Amino acid sequence: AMKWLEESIMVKRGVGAGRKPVTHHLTEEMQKEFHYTIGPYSTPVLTIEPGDRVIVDTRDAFEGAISSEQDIPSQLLKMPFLNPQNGPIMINGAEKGDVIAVYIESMLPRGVNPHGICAMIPHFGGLTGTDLTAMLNDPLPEKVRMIKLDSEKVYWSERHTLPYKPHIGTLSVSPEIDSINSLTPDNHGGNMDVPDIGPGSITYLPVRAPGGRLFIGDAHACQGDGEICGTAVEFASITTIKVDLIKNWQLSWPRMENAETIMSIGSARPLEDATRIAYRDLIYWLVADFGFEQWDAYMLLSQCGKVRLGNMVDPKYTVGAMLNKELLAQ
Amino acid sequence: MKWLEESIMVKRGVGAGRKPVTHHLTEEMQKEFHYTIGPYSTPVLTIEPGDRVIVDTRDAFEGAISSEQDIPSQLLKMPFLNPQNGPIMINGAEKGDVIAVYIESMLPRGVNPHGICAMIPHFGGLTGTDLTAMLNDPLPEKVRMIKLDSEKVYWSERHTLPYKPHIGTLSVSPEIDSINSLTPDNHGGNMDVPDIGPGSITYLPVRAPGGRLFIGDAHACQGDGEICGTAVEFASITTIKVDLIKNWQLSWPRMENAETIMSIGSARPLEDATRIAYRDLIYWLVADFGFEQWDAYMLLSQCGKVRLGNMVDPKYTVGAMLNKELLAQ
Amino acid sequence: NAMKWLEESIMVKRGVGAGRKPVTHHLTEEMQKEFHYTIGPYSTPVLTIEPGDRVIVDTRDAFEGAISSEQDIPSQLLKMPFLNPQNGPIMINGAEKGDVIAVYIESMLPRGVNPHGICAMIPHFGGLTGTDLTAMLNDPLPEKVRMIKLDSEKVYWSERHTLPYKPHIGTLSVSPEIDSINSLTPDNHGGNMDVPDIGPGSITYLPVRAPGGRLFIGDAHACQGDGEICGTAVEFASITTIKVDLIKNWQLSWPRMENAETIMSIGSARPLEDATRIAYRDLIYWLVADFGFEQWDAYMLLSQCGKVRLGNMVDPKYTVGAMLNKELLAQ
Amino acid sequence: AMKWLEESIMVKRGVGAGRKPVTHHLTEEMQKEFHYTIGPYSTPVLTIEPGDRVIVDTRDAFEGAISSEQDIPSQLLKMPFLNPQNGPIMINGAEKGDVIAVYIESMLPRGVNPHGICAMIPHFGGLTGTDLTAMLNDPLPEKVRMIKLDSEKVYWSERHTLPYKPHIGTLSVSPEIDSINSLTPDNHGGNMDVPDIGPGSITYLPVRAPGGRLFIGDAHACQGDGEICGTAVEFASITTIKVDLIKNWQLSWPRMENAETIMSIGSARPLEDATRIAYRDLIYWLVADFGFEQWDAYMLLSQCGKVRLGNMVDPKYTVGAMLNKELLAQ
Ligand code: NA
Ligand code: NA
Ligand code: NA
Ligand code: NA
Ligand code: NA
Ligand code: NA
Ligand code: NA
Ligand code: NA
């Protein structure tokens, strides 16, 4: 957003820092086929230089299959085939041990008279039995909400008009040899559904495949902590990002940064392990780059640490452990 | 502090316009602090709904730790932490009612007051414990004596934290069970939710005659999850206003403050604690705020906020929130 | 000569009451007066015995006889978590914190004329349904009740299935030091473990934390699957005969049991992994303390020979038993 | 007596039943390169007819990297690269919706003076903090045991001589589009570490990729319930299997069968969800193929169901829900 970028890790360590960036338009025609698995086997759709900008025309989580409140999700969708992905985008010079920095500049709704979509998919959500939390109870009612929206507000209903706080649900890089579905978050990023990953945020992803192989998709107009019903307000967007490369920075999990905080993003089940992963990664980050002594960092976070529950519905839950940048002062 | 006029405690509390009697629950009045919360303890004080109570709480270690050279494993015996004040009896309280506890203020108690943070062996969020049973050596045994005042917590040369006090253990008695002071459950307990401080009203479901309110474990500050096992534990002068709401069936504790309402669920694994909180919030929105169930569920998937209380105690605690602006018709 | 293994049991080798002509007490409903739904040190004692004595307990079913027809509706007749009415507390002379109560179950027979067991699907309670802990918004499962005829040989489930009579105690426990835990929860004091192995021919070891021990028993099952997945087993009223003895100064953190072929550490918690960790770790500590094992060898050996029994996966805390065959205890 | 096979699902529904099978020798020379990811992108190494036999020369979980008790696992291994896989094997006619039936005939130790290996790998095991159950404690001691073995016994130590009960730790088929690492079990099979999957067992795996794409590996000379320290007695083997194909049999999870029982194998975290998955699958199996009414099956299993804890160390835990074949009688 403002001048905090000057002190960001991306600007201070990114190799593309002072470059006049080339802006690429990743349209649907360039993408050709959207992907439902994130790995090293997909044919690259674009190759960029670190520091370049990319304007992505993303598709909603249902790849436009739902367009009416009278639609029936169980008849139009097949789990886990949600979150069609743009990519893979190749970053010149990226190799295992590096980090892709993704700065989201803006996110606007795409199409004339744009609509977002929230849905209650049978056997999927936070307060229902699913195919993982296998119960014998009947699934919840099958609902769909077509919500009108603009760059300022989300028109949920007569009673509630929500602010437009867009963010990317699925942001990731390829694993070394595995190919993970677009519904799962892991140590490569993925379907994290962390509300903070929107305009004014920089997400750091660990490279494990040559070229990085950046994937993006599943834009949300807004989202609650946990994305409890299974979906947020899913919409097609024009997401503009700046991608840079940090050389030889060993990360085990995704990290992000914004004007006010730094955050370690862990993903797993049960939810406590996702939280352990995040907090422990944050502690290692504080010791490595911010001069903290390990036990002091641990005990300090027991007084100042902040937690963001991302999703609690996907194959793996996602949690972000934060620390306010004011507490990083030496 | 105008929001109190619209609070559930003021609008439904029977003690609302009373000139309250202020009781001083000193250590001499308390006699013996408790490590179990139930209906078997002898009452220490009886009050009228609307009365104020000035509680002289003891720290989580009951003063057993006073030096950074102390060794927790030699001075503490788990799970005997969080000595409790109470039980306090509310006149007229019976099963089906709710005790509303409004915290007015919290100040450090004693001359040259110090808070305490400790890494207790086999206890904490990033260590094997007696529940998450591992064979690894326990983490180093550490203790921090932190100087503090009504304005700041002097953690170190590098970090000076703001003083945001809150109560770690706030509860009412179960009908027949007696739960230890280290565990949070449907009666409240050791929730360690940072939001339960000055300017908050906590609603607890009565299941025993008289309510039997217990309080303790004051924190000068606390992170989400209380990850190392302890916050900045200190002895305090906690002033509360306790009132009674008649015939309001609650299954779990709820709280309210200037900006939000929250349902507090406690359990393991952490997902279930969160499910409990969110589901309770949804039932609360349907019952008292005119929401249709499925709309509330899908709406919270866009606006719900989550507070990770503790992720170290026998049961983890999570708060599901909704901003009061979204309660408008 | 099947009861030969008892001679080598921990109860016989270390129990203070070994060799005594035991006094047999009849814990009838008239002696019990009121059954309890919470296990702690505040209940009035109903019986005091000497270590080595026998007790014939007339237990009540998990519903305290509230259900007697397949047309009954559990949600209208039961209030959770008030299940498993308990017999006790029984006081053992000399028992104090640091000791262990050894409970050997001799036999379990169905009580009453034309006895019936009961299996039920209670709304918001069970392994494959949302509950008040695993809080879901889905409708509860159908409300079912099965009245099963039974005898000392078989459980007449249906025309198609006749199950063998393998009775065991669901709730066996001792009082905590100061807490009073409900009769539906298992913990480090024993409790509602629902471990099928705790039946005739088994000796359960419980850690004493309250003076006199304060032994509680109840919730007899005619049979039970691993996990007790629907929420209930075949619940029935029984005549359970036990022999209770006392082992002095044997520090245990969790319940343990022993039978003709194995030893087992019983852990209880949520999530289920932690219940299993507790059990296995306790077993490892037991092998190091009493059977001359080196810790890491025991750990790696159990990774090859350890056996696990899923007790319940429905109660407030799940229960898991980690076992080792007695043949592997030989030096 | 192998009389029970006549009533097995493989013999009654397998298309290859009655064929004079062709026996293939899947040697290391045929395999060329062992795989650490299971998916549809690997080049096929062998194509067989349903009913054929395959003699597989498997490699141990460490791909021979450990050969001395003085070896240091953290210096010789890189997690999660364990369990080198043989395959993919193609079954002629296999397509999505089918099931691969894998009957294990025998398993013998391979090599001169064969040795099995048990190891305590840092940050991996049931009773230690790991990278998923992220703790700050020091890892457990780094230990290795070289165990001599033969077709009759496992020479653990002077004090303990264990019986030779071999079984396959990793048995799987390819996902439709994903490629899952060889350390993870899921709905495609994988690193289940279920002791029952040995000689005299038939494992049923759901086909989701054309040709099935069968993968096998990680032979164990023995294993405890949970494989608590992280590893069993890992060894290189000569595993002989008979692979057949069952047409149009919709399965969501792996199933197995032996002389005395049928079992549904679920994999997930936390451990209760793995168990829910298994039991629910068993109930659906009993309703579909054995004439049970759903609620009766559920309540009956609450009296007769048996549970096998497979592993409680891998990225996903594995649990088997069983029912004795005597209770399947109409
Ligand atoms: Na998403
Ligand atoms: Na989404
Ligand atoms: Na606390
Ligand atoms: Na505290
Ligand atoms: Na029970
Ligand atoms: Na029972
Ligand atoms: Na394995
Ligand atoms: Na293995």
mmCIF file of C-alpha atoms in Angstrom, chain D residues 36-298:
data_model
loop_
_atom_site.group_PDB
_atom_site.id
_atom_site.type_symbol
_atom_site.label_atom_id
_atom_site.label_comp_id
_atom_site.label_asym_id
_atom_site.label_seq_id
_atom_site.Cartn_x
_atom_site.Cartn_y
_atom_site.Cartn_z
ATOM 1 C CA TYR D 36 8.666 -41.467 -4.325
ATOM 2 C CA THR D 37 5.342 -40.095 -5.671
ATOM 3 C CA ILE D 38 2.271 -42.109 -6.748
ATOM 4 C CA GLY D 39 0.283 -40.685 -9.668
ATOM 5 C CA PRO D 40 -0.496 -40.758 -13.409
ATOM 6 C CA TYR D 41 2.731 -39.077 -14.627
ATOM 7 C CA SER D 42 5.230 -41.942 -14.137
ATOM 8 C CA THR D 43 6.143 -44.013 -17.217
ATOM 9 C CA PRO D 44 4.637 -47.540 -16.969
ATOM 10 C CA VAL D 45 7.158 -50.301 -16.208
ATOM 11 C CA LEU D 46 4.932 -53.324 -16.878
ATOM 12 C CA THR D 47 1.545 -54.156 -18.414
ATOM 13 C CA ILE D 48 -0.344 -57.274 -17.312
ATOM 14 C CA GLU D 49 -3.616 -59.125 -17.886
ATOM 15 C CA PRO D 50 -6.083 -59.455 -15.004
ATOM 16 C CA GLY D 51 -5.254 -62.716 -13.214
ATOM 17 C CA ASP D 52 -1.501 -62.567 -13.922
ATOM 18 C CA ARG D 53 1.166 -62.987 -11.249
ATOM 19 C CA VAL D 54 4.012 -60.539 -10.566
ATOM 20 C CA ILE D 55 7.203 -61.354 -8.653
ATOM 21 C CA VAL D 56 8.422 -58.011 -7.298
ATOM 22 C CA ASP D 57 11.999 -57.364 -6.093
ATOM 23 C CA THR D 58 11.190 -54.561 -3.626
ATOM 24 C CA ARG D 59 13.675 -52.205 -1.987
ATOM 25 C CA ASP D 60 13.576 -51.268 1.703
ATOM 26 C CA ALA D 61 12.079 -47.991 2.952
ATOM 27 C CA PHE D 62 15.509 -46.292 2.914
ATOM 28 C CA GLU D 63 16.440 -47.563 -0.584
ATOM 29 C CA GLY D 64 19.496 -49.253 0.949
ATOM 30 C CA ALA D 65 20.872 -46.008 2.436
ATOM 31 C CA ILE D 66 21.215 -47.544 5.915
ATOM 32 C CA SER D 67 23.457 -50.574 6.475
ATOM 33 C CA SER D 68 25.065 -50.033 9.905
ATOM 34 C CA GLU D 69 23.922 -49.331 13.452
ATOM 35 C CA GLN D 70 26.504 -46.464 13.456
ATOM 36 C CA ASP D 71 24.661 -44.725 10.578
ATOM 37 C CA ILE D 72 22.989 -41.393 11.275
ATOM 38 C CA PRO D 73 19.499 -41.175 9.670
ATOM 39 C CA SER D 74 19.351 -37.325 9.634
ATOM 40 C CA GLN D 75 22.508 -37.279 7.461
ATOM 41 C CA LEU D 76 21.486 -40.140 5.110
ATOM 42 C CA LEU D 77 17.730 -39.465 4.678
ATOM 43 C CA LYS D 78 15.636 -36.529 3.485
ATOM 44 C CA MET D 79 11.984 -36.640 4.612
ATOM 45 C CA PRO D 80 9.540 -37.444 3.192
ATOM 46 C CA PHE D 81 11.625 -39.429 0.643
ATOM 47 C CA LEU D 82 11.101 -42.924 2.028
ATOM 48 C CA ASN D 83 9.434 -46.029 0.595
ATOM 49 C CA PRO D 84 10.834 -46.312 -2.964
ATOM 50 C CA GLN D 85 7.982 -47.687 -5.099
ATOM 51 C CA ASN D 86 7.826 -50.427 -7.717
ATOM 52 C CA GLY D 87 5.401 -49.601 -10.538
ATOM 53 C CA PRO D 88 3.349 -48.342 -12.085
ATOM 54 C CA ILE D 89 1.971 -51.692 -13.231
ATOM 55 C CA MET D 90 -0.825 -51.449 -15.833
ATOM 56 C CA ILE D 91 -3.805 -53.779 -15.786
ATOM 57 C CA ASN D 92 -5.358 -54.288 -19.229
ATOM 58 C CA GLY D 93 -8.960 -53.030 -19.248
ATOM 59 C CA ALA D 94 -8.822 -51.135 -15.928
ATOM 60 C CA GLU D 95 -10.729 -47.829 -15.955
ATOM 61 C CA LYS D 96 -12.215 -45.400 -13.451
ATOM 62 C CA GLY D 97 -14.964 -47.116 -11.457
ATOM 63 C CA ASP D 98 -13.173 -50.492 -11.423
ATOM 64 C CA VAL D 99 -11.207 -52.110 -8.610
ATOM 65 C CA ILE D 100 -7.783 -53.752 -8.580
ATOM 66 C CA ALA D 101 -7.660 -56.887 -6.425
ATOM 67 C CA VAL D 102 -4.164 -57.627 -5.119
ATOM 68 C CA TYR D 103 -3.660 -61.058 -3.567
ATOM 69 C CA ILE D 104 -0.296 -61.455 -1.830
ATOM 70 C CA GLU D 105 0.911 -65.058 -2.136
ATOM 71 C CA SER D 106 4.275 -64.840 -0.444
ATOM 72 C CA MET D 107 7.015 -62.540 0.825
ATOM 73 C CA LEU D 108 10.607 -63.660 1.324
ATOM 74 C CA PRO D 109 13.717 -61.688 2.312
ATOM 75 C CA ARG D 110 15.905 -60.715 -0.638
ATOM 76 C CA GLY D 111 19.728 -60.701 -0.769
ATOM 77 C CA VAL D 112 22.556 -62.734 0.754
ATOM 78 C CA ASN D 113 22.520 -62.821 4.609
ATOM 79 C CA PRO D 114 19.442 -60.538 4.671
ATOM 80 C CA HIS D 115 18.919 -57.903 7.314
ATOM 81 C CA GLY D 116 15.876 -55.829 8.251
ATOM 82 C CA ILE D 117 16.193 -52.310 9.703
ATOM 83 C CA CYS D 118 14.345 -50.414 12.422
ATOM 84 C CA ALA D 119 15.185 -46.747 12.942
ATOM 85 C CA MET D 120 14.309 -43.749 15.070
ATOM 86 C CA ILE D 121 14.405 -40.898 12.613
ATOM 87 C CA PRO D 122 14.577 -37.427 14.174
ATOM 88 C CA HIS D 123 11.273 -35.502 14.083
ATOM 89 C CA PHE D 124 9.391 -38.620 12.943
ATOM 90 C CA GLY D 125 7.437 -41.141 15.028
ATOM 91 C CA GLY D 126 4.416 -41.602 17.266
ATOM 92 C CA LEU D 127 5.933 -40.526 20.613
ATOM 93 C CA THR D 128 7.864 -37.466 19.413
ATOM 94 C CA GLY D 129 7.217 -33.978 18.148
ATOM 95 C CA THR D 130 7.424 -33.916 14.350
ATOM 96 C CA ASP D 131 7.132 -31.326 11.579
ATOM 97 C CA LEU D 132 3.312 -31.744 11.743
ATOM 98 C CA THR D 133 2.925 -32.047 15.547
ATOM 99 C CA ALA D 134 5.422 -29.145 15.775
ATOM 100 C CA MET D 135 7.157 -29.020 19.154
ATOM 101 C CA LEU D 136 10.278 -27.185 20.288
ATOM 102 C CA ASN D 137 11.733 -30.147 22.191
ATOM 103 C CA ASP D 138 14.964 -31.780 21.117
ATOM 104 C CA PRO D 139 14.382 -34.756 18.848
ATOM 105 C CA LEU D 140 14.679 -38.278 20.237
ATOM 106 C CA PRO D 141 17.999 -40.075 20.015
ATOM 107 C CA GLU D 142 18.961 -41.144 16.582
ATOM 108 C CA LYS D 143 18.946 -44.980 16.631
ATOM 109 C CA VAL D 144 19.340 -47.800 14.116
ATOM 110 C CA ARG D 145 18.935 -51.551 14.560
ATOM 111 C CA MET D 146 20.256 -54.082 12.017
ATOM 112 C CA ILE D 147 18.146 -57.151 12.527
ATOM 113 C CA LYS D 148 19.092 -60.506 11.042
ATOM 114 C CA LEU D 149 16.125 -62.389 9.645
ATOM 115 C CA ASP D 150 14.898 -65.426 7.747
ATOM 116 C CA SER D 151 11.573 -66.923 6.507
ATOM 117 C CA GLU D 152 10.797 -68.103 10.045
ATOM 118 C CA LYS D 153 12.033 -65.484 12.582
ATOM 119 C CA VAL D 154 13.202 -61.897 13.204
ATOM 120 C CA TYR D 155 16.266 -61.866 15.492
ATOM 121 C CA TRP D 156 15.534 -58.633 17.372
ATOM 122 C CA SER D 157 17.872 -59.431 20.283
ATOM 123 C CA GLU D 158 19.155 -62.159 22.630
ATOM 124 C CA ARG D 159 16.047 -61.593 24.730
ATOM 125 C CA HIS D 160 13.449 -61.299 21.914
ATOM 126 C CA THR D 161 13.073 -63.420 18.781
ATOM 127 C CA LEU D 162 9.939 -62.342 16.927
ATOM 128 C CA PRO D 163 7.952 -64.420 14.434
ATOM 129 C CA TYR D 164 8.289 -63.522 10.756
ATOM 130 C CA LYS D 165 4.919 -61.942 9.847
ATOM 131 C CA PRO D 166 5.677 -60.007 6.682
ATOM 132 C CA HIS D 167 3.328 -57.485 5.064
ATOM 133 C CA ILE D 168 3.346 -54.636 2.565
ATOM 134 C CA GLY D 169 3.427 -51.120 3.976
ATOM 135 C CA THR D 170 2.732 -49.272 0.712
ATOM 136 C CA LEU D 171 0.201 -50.732 -1.730
ATOM 137 C CA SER D 172 -1.646 -48.304 -4.004
ATOM 138 C CA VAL D 173 -3.142 -47.208 -7.299
ATOM 139 C CA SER D 174 -2.829 -43.800 -8.985
ATOM 140 C CA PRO D 175 -5.187 -40.914 -8.260
ATOM 141 C CA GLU D 176 -6.979 -39.428 -11.274
ATOM 142 C CA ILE D 177 -4.821 -36.267 -11.507
ATOM 143 C CA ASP D 178 -2.939 -35.938 -8.196
ATOM 144 C CA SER D 179 0.465 -37.444 -7.423
ATOM 145 C CA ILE D 180 0.728 -38.273 -3.694
ATOM 146 C CA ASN D 181 4.085 -38.953 -2.002
ATOM 147 C CA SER D 182 5.077 -42.512 -1.082
ATOM 148 C CA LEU D 183 4.915 -41.670 2.632
ATOM 149 C CA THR D 184 1.184 -40.804 2.622
ATOM 150 C CA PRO D 185 -1.879 -43.137 2.718
ATOM 151 C CA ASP D 186 -5.194 -41.846 1.343
ATOM 152 C CA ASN D 187 -8.264 -43.047 -0.660
ATOM 153 C CA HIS D 188 -5.932 -44.625 -3.239
ATOM 154 C CA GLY D 189 -4.165 -46.866 -0.692
ATOM 155 C CA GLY D 190 -0.587 -45.721 -0.137
ATOM 156 C CA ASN D 191 1.593 -45.938 2.982
ATOM 157 C CA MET D 192 -1.100 -47.561 5.133
ATOM 158 C CA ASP D 193 1.212 -49.740 7.215
ATOM 159 C CA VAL D 194 -1.594 -52.178 8.080
ATOM 160 C CA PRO D 195 -0.030 -55.463 9.404
ATOM 161 C CA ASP D 196 -2.871 -57.524 7.889
ATOM 162 C CA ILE D 197 -1.833 -56.743 4.281
ATOM 163 C CA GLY D 198 0.482 -59.747 3.924
ATOM 164 C CA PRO D 199 0.476 -63.316 2.568
ATOM 165 C CA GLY D 200 -3.085 -64.644 2.505
ATOM 166 C CA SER D 201 -4.723 -61.217 2.092
ATOM 167 C CA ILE D 202 -6.521 -59.634 -0.856
ATOM 168 C CA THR D 203 -6.510 -55.832 -1.008
ATOM 169 C CA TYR D 204 -9.149 -53.995 -3.094
ATOM 170 C CA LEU D 205 -8.113 -50.584 -4.497
ATOM 171 C CA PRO D 206 -10.375 -48.151 -6.385
ATOM 172 C CA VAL D 207 -9.253 -47.347 -9.914
ATOM 173 C CA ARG D 208 -9.315 -43.655 -10.866
ATOM 174 C CA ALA D 209 -6.692 -43.585 -13.667
ATOM 175 C CA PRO D 210 -6.732 -45.603 -16.907
ATOM 176 C CA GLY D 211 -4.822 -48.879 -16.467
ATOM 177 C CA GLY D 212 -5.052 -48.725 -12.674
ATOM 178 C CA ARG D 213 -1.374 -47.873 -12.141
ATOM 179 C CA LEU D 214 -0.521 -50.238 -9.283
ATOM 180 C CA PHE D 215 2.397 -49.338 -7.010
ATOM 181 C CA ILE D 216 3.956 -51.578 -4.341
ATOM 182 C CA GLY D 217 6.817 -51.356 -1.820
ATOM 183 C CA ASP D 218 7.974 -50.925 1.781
ATOM 184 C CA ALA D 219 7.974 -54.556 2.912
ATOM 185 C CA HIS D 220 7.937 -55.154 6.699
ATOM 186 C CA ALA D 221 9.192 -58.314 8.426
ATOM 187 C CA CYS D 222 6.823 -57.481 11.301
ATOM 188 C CA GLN D 223 4.965 -54.454 12.746
ATOM 189 C CA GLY D 224 3.101 -53.349 15.848
ATOM 190 C CA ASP D 225 -0.271 -51.605 15.879
ATOM 191 C CA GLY D 226 0.523 -47.962 15.180
ATOM 192 C CA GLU D 227 4.185 -48.539 14.094
ATOM 193 C CA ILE D 228 4.832 -46.262 17.067
ATOM 194 C CA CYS D 229 8.589 -45.436 16.687
ATOM 195 C CA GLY D 230 8.109 -44.431 13.025
ATOM 196 C CA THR D 231 9.439 -47.614 11.408
ATOM 197 C CA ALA D 232 8.822 -51.343 11.496
ATOM 198 C CA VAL D 233 11.500 -53.892 10.532
ATOM 199 C CA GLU D 234 12.116 -52.530 7.024
ATOM 200 C CA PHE D 235 13.559 -54.979 4.466
ATOM 201 C CA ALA D 236 14.113 -55.731 0.776
ATOM 202 C CA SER D 237 11.821 -58.561 -0.392
ATOM 203 C CA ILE D 238 10.695 -60.910 -3.118
ATOM 204 C CA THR D 239 6.946 -60.241 -2.986
ATOM 205 C CA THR D 240 4.768 -62.398 -5.217
ATOM 206 C CA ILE D 241 1.272 -61.083 -5.981
ATOM 207 C CA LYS D 242 -1.724 -62.042 -8.124
ATOM 208 C CA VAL D 243 -3.499 -58.991 -9.551
ATOM 209 C CA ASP D 244 -7.044 -59.201 -10.910
ATOM 210 C CA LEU D 245 -9.744 -56.710 -11.957
ATOM 211 C CA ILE D 246 -13.326 -56.261 -10.717
ATOM 212 C CA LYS D 247 -15.455 -54.238 -13.112
ATOM 213 C CA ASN D 248 -17.728 -51.376 -12.099
ATOM 214 C CA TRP D 249 -17.538 -51.643 -8.270
ATOM 215 C CA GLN D 250 -17.670 -48.169 -6.757
ATOM 216 C CA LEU D 251 -15.351 -47.836 -3.745
ATOM 217 C CA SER D 252 -14.357 -44.644 -1.985
ATOM 218 C CA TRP D 253 -11.657 -46.248 0.171
ATOM 219 C CA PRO D 254 -9.432 -49.330 0.130
ATOM 220 C CA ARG D 255 -10.828 -52.618 1.426
ATOM 221 C CA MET D 256 -9.217 -55.940 2.199
ATOM 222 C CA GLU D 257 -10.210 -59.482 2.879
ATOM 223 C CA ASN D 258 -8.582 -62.569 4.386
ATOM 224 C CA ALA D 259 -9.589 -66.022 5.634
ATOM 225 C CA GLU D 260 -11.460 -64.666 8.678
ATOM 226 C CA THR D 261 -12.534 -61.031 7.996
ATOM 227 C CA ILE D 262 -13.380 -58.161 5.661
ATOM 228 C CA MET D 263 -12.028 -54.672 6.431
ATOM 229 C CA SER D 264 -12.507 -51.077 5.349
ATOM 230 C CA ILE D 265 -9.311 -49.015 5.498
ATOM 231 C CA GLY D 266 -9.642 -45.301 6.232
ATOM 232 C CA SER D 267 -6.792 -42.787 6.400
ATOM 233 C CA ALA D 268 -6.779 -39.284 7.919
ATOM 234 C CA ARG D 269 -5.978 -36.980 10.846
ATOM 235 C CA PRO D 270 -7.021 -36.738 13.565
ATOM 236 C CA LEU D 271 -7.124 -40.467 14.390
ATOM 237 C CA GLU D 272 -10.900 -40.400 15.142
ATOM 238 C CA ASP D 273 -11.689 -39.289 11.589
ATOM 239 C CA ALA D 274 -9.611 -42.164 10.215
ATOM 240 C CA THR D 275 -11.713 -44.483 12.371
ATOM 241 C CA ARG D 276 -15.005 -42.800 11.322
ATOM 242 C CA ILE D 277 -14.085 -43.213 7.658
ATOM 243 C CA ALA D 278 -13.323 -46.919 8.149
ATOM 244 C CA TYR D 279 -16.429 -47.737 10.146
ATOM 245 C CA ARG D 280 -18.731 -45.736 7.868
ATOM 246 C CA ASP D 281 -17.269 -47.424 4.781
ATOM 247 C CA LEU D 282 -17.760 -50.829 6.406
ATOM 248 C CA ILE D 283 -21.415 -49.966 7.132
ATOM 249 C CA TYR D 284 -21.955 -48.913 3.507
ATOM 250 C CA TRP D 285 -20.284 -52.142 2.374
ATOM 251 C CA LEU D 286 -22.538 -54.250 4.614
ATOM 252 C CA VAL D 287 -25.663 -52.472 3.277
ATOM 253 C CA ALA D 288 -24.637 -52.696 -0.389
ATOM 254 C CA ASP D 289 -23.296 -56.272 -0.663
ATOM 255 C CA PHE D 290 -24.441 -58.167 2.472
ATOM 256 C CA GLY D 291 -28.156 -57.280 2.849
ATOM 257 C CA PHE D 292 -27.849 -55.246 6.057
ATOM 258 C CA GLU D 293 -30.229 -52.438 6.974
ATOM 259 C CA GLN D 294 -28.102 -49.325 7.738
ATOM 260 C CA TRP D 295 -29.070 -48.653 11.372
ATOM 261 C CA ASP D 296 -28.923 -52.345 12.285
ATOM 262 C CA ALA D 297 -25.391 -52.555 10.825
ATOM 263 C CA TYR D 298 -24.337 -49.464 12.797
#
